[PDB]
Amino acid sequence: LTPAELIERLEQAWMNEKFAPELLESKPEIVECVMEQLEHMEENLDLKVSIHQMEMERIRYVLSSYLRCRLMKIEKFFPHVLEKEKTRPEGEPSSLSPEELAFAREFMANTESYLKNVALKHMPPNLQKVDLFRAVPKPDLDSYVFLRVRERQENILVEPDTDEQRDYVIDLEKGSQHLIRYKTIAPLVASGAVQL
Amino acid sequence: MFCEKAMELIRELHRAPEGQLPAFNEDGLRQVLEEMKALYEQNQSDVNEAKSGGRSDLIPTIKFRHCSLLRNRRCTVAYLYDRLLRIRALRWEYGSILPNALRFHMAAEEMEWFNNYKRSLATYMRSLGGDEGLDITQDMKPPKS
Amino acid sequence: SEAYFRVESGALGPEENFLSLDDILMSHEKLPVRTETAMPRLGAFFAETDNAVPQGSKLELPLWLAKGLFDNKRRILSVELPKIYQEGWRTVFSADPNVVDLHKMGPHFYGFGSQLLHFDSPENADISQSLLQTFIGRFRRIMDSSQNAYNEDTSALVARLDEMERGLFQTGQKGLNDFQCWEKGQ
Amino acid sequence: MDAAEVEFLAEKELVTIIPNFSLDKIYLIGGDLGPFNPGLPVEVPLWLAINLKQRQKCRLLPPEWMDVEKLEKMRDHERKEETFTPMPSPYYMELTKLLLNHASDNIPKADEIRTLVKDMWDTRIAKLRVSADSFVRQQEAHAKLDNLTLMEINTSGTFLTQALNHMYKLRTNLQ
């Protein structure tokens, strides 16, 4: 609830977003509070001044980087981002802020239109519709990642491959660092029990 | 034989490093769209005979033509999509105004895609902070004074 | 450059990625096949039964085409395994994977190999295990040179790497060079 | 993530400076700092210390571990061990780089300290290569690595994870 904690939360999202193979949950409450803090401090604006402006730059940088990272993911999986939001059950956290959603919609329309007018409409009658949900790659959740355990977790199943015989249980201790498949610890990233 | 023209579009982009943008291949795109038309017409004819007037001995040839159609379609779409990705990159590397070298190798339609894109990014970035706040096109690198 | 995010290969998985330029290049490569029927009008190697292809004809077809014409029943055609995946080379890969030139004998050794599994060859299990063991046996030499562990000319090593390995090489090199530029920031 | 961003996080680490000026505690969004008093030790973030040193408004104090004798023992320890040993700081490479580059005048035997830390880095990256080969050859799917630093993990970790991703596909292509 404190500013210091606000910043820690941001850096956490920044780092997690950088390494997760899929688009993570939208953190509107964090982005806003950070924008407010910057606005307030910006207005309050001698050596103390230069020190404050230096810190403001450090924070501005993390926000921008985090937001930049989210846009590239939205662009990369745009059809899957839109389809997931469309069938998202009421209550579950969205992977898109109202603004990012607009950006994603526009990306889709623009690309689909470009593709239609430039080639598809000029193709035979039975080959003019291209399924974008199929043409564009989905996130690969079977990607390996490194993490730092923030909160102790037990009975975590490690699945080497598709052969159940190689499966074994593991426990993640607070402060430890691990290497493992993302899909196995995805829920832990979301809950904040672990950090990528 | 078939789909060779389509492969020329792929090799052309593939040999363009760093995401460089060679001239839009209008001729190549036209020749491919034509082959598709021809392939589709030839196939639409043999299918008739197969149905009544010929034999189910054309089916193998019909499948061959079909695959060749799907293949040409895969190549062109892939070709066009890759160009858009390289063009999307331009906004983040050069800014909102592109140099002559890039715009002269871009198709009018690609320029429009770029503009639609930068207009959407401007709107996104502007909704971020107050009335007009946070150009996330700046601060591309960690601050170091 | 930095903001250009091309579609990556998917050849190692169930199927290739539709928009992957690399997969399109990989699927253009030819593989031995044998006709199991007659193919009219397609005889011009592209009068005699309207120009048909003789049943039981051995041909070199692009992977994508064979994929499209193939069927387990093996009615349209049957495919043969390229040499690099047969008993012979499999034995050499097994003794020591580092000696082979996967660029020359590839250049999409692993990706073509994975997609080749789609033809239900009796030796699919042999082909599959060979692919994994070959990468396992070559892993160290790629990591070593990509990080220039021995201060030697990598150009020669990179020239004998298949396309997947070259990318791996790139990642390793990029990571190290990025670190060395930072470490030297005035 | 690039090496510049790793250093960005390292810059948060606290270090001790000796101000040559006076100033009331500042209230930064991340936490209070100061007050500052001439000749009196203060705890400040590395990025602030670096800036003040450049501005010549303070003296940089070297970490207790940044000592030729201790580092000399750490380097030998790391070489004797097959596994990774506990590093002095989770940002030892960044702190050496930044401190030696902006306050070598405040760090004794800076020349030697640079060689000892450079050696530790060389021996640990090489060890990471040998460790990864063992991990891959035994086809492992999980690993604990409490002693590795972020700079090390980030520098060659994309290579290891990309390789593991491919092996996962190859290990499961007949499924």
Curated annotation (Swiss-Prot), chain A:
Record protein name field: DNA replication complex GINS protein SLD5
Record key words, sorted: Acetylation, Chromosome, Cytoplasm, DNA replication, Nucleus, Phosphoprotein
Gene3D superfamilies xref list: 1.20.58.1030, 3.40.5.60
GO cellular component entries: CMG complex; cytoplasm; GINS complex; nucleoplasm; nucleus
Cross-referenced CDD domains: GINS_A_Sld5, GINS_B_Sld5
InterPro entries membership: GINS_A (IPR021151), GINS_bundle-like_dom_sf (IPR036224), GINS_Sld5 (IPR008591), SLD5_C (IPR031633), Sld5_GINS_A (IPR038749)
Protein family according to the UniProt entry: Belongs to the GINS4/SLD5 family.
Region (Important for GINS complex assembly), start-end ranges: 140-196
Subunit structure: Component of the GINS complex which is a heterotetramer of GINS1, GINS2, GINS3 and GINS4. Forms a stable subcomplex with GINS1. GINS complex interacts with DNA primase in vitro. Component of the CMG helicase complex, a hexameric ring of related MCM2-7 subunits stabilized by CDC45 and the tetrameric GINS complex.
Main location: nucleus
Highest taxon in the source lineage: Eukaryota
Gene name linked to the record: GINS4
Induction: Significantly up-regulated in aggressive melanomas.
Known function: Required for correct functioning of the GINS complex, a complex that plays an essential role in the initiation of DNA replication, and progression of DNA replication forks. GINS complex is a core component of CDC45-MCM-GINS (CMG) helicase, the molecular machine that unwinds template DNA during replication, and around which the replisome is built.
Locations listed in the record: Nucleus; Chromosome; Cytoplasm
Pfam families in UniProt: Sld5, SLD5_C
One GO BP: double-strand break repair via break-induced replication
From Swiss-Prot, chain B:
Subcellular location: Nucleus; Chromosome
GO BP terms in the entry: DNA strand elongation involved in mitotic DNA replication; inner cell mass cell proliferation
Keyword Nucleus found: yes
GO cellular component: CMG complex; cytoplasm; GINS complex; nucleoplasm; nucleus
Induction trigger: Significantly up-regulated in aggressive melanomas.
Subunit annotation: Component of the GINS complex which is a heterotetramer of GINS1, GINS2, GINS3 and GINS4. Forms a stable subcomplex with GINS4. GINS complex interacts with DNA primase in vitro. Component of the CMG helicase complex, a hexameric ring of related MCM2-7 subunits stabilized by CDC45 and the tetrameric GINS complex.
Reported function: Required for correct functioning of the GINS complex, a complex that plays an essential role in the initiation of DNA replication, and progression of DNA replication forks. GINS complex is a core component of CDC45-MCM-GINS (CMG) helicase, the molecular machine that unwinds template DNA during replication, and around which the replisome is built.
Protein name: DNA replication complex GINS protein PSF1
Swiss-Prot record, chain C:
Cellular compartments per GO CC: CMG complex; GINS complex; nucleoplasm; nucleus
Biological process annotations from GO: cellular senescence; mitotic DNA replication initiation; multicellular organism growth
Disulfide bonds: none
Region described as Not essential for folding and stability of GINS complex, but may regulate accessibility to the central complex pore: spans on this chain: 1-15
Coiled coil: none
Main location: nucleus
InterPro entries: GINS_A, GINS_bundle-like_dom_sf, GINS_Psf3, GINS_Psf3_sf, PSF3_N
Taxonomic superkingdom: Eukaryota
Subcellular locations according to the entry: Nucleus; Chromosome
Keyword field contains Signal: no
UniProt keyword annotations, A-Z: Chromosome, DNA replication, Nucleus
Family: Belongs to the GINS3/PSF3 family.
Subunit text: Component of the GINS complex which is a heterotetramer of GINS1, GINS2, GINS3 and GINS4. Forms a stable subcomplex with GINS2. GINS complex interacts with DNA primase in vitro. Component of the CMG helicase complex, a hexameric ring of related MCM2-7 subunits stabilized by CDC45 and the tetrameric GINS complex.
Functional summary from the UniProt entry: Required for correct functioning of the GINS complex, a complex that plays an essential role in the initiation of DNA replication, and progression of DNA replication forks. GINS complex is a core component of CDC45-MCM-GINS (CMG) helicase, the molecular machine that unwinds template DNA during replication, and around which the replisome is built.
The protein, known as: DNA replication complex GINS protein PSF3
Upper classification of the organism: Eukaryota, Metazoa, Chordata, Craniata, Vertebrata
Gene: GINS3
Curated annotation (Swiss-Prot), chain D:
Assembly and interaction partners: Component of the GINS complex which is a heterotetramer of GINS1, GINS2, GINS3 and GINS4. Forms a stable subcomplex with GINS3. GINS complex interacts with DNA primase in vitro. Component of the CMG helicase complex, a hexameric ring of related MCM2-7 subunits stabilized by CDC45 and the tetrameric GINS complex.
InterPro entries according to UniProt: GINS_A (IPR021151), GINS_bundle-like_dom_sf (IPR036224), GINS_Psf2 (IPR007257), PSF2_N (IPR056784)
Residue positions where N-acetylmethionine is found in the record: 1
Protein name: DNA replication complex GINS protein PSF2
Keywords: Acetylation, Chromosome, DNA replication, Isopeptide bond, Nucleus, Phosphoprotein, Ubl conjugation
Pfam family, one: Sld5
GO cellular component, one term: nucleus
Cross-link (Glycyl lysine isopeptide (Lys-Gly) (interchain with G-Cter in SUMO2)): 109
Signal peptide start-end: none
PANTHER family: DNA REPLICATION COMPLEX GINS PROTEIN PSF2 (PTHR12772:SF0)
Subcellular location: Nucleus; Chromosome
